[PDB]
């Protein structure tokens, strides 16, 4: 039972029911983050500056628990 806050590229996972706090990094910048059952879906930052360029091959990251490595979506 943990409350998670996601920054631009860093996530803080504070245990509320029991335990301390944890923190995880990410391969790149994150646009947004959406919760799903047992994990979070992370969307890459698309464009910033005013040139508008973006990536499309893979921009979504699935993680179950903070310590385990990330996973890739399938479409």
């Amino acid at each position: 039972d943990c409350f998670v806050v996601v920054l631009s590229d860093i996530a803080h996972v504070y245990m509320l029911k029991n335990g301390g706090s944890t923190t995880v990094c990410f391969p790149f910048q994150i646009g947004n983050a959406f919760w799903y059952a047992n994990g979070v879906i992370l969307e890459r930052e698309t464009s910033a500056s005013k040139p508008i360029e973006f990536d499309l091959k893979h921009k979504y990251i699935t993680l179950t628990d903070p310590m385990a490595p990330f996973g890739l979506i399938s479409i």
């Binding site: 860093i10 706090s21 944890t22 923190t23 995880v24 990094c25």
Partner: peptide
Amino acid sequence: QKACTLKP
């Protein structure tokens, strides 16, 4: 733990 975030 803090050093972990710098160079994971």
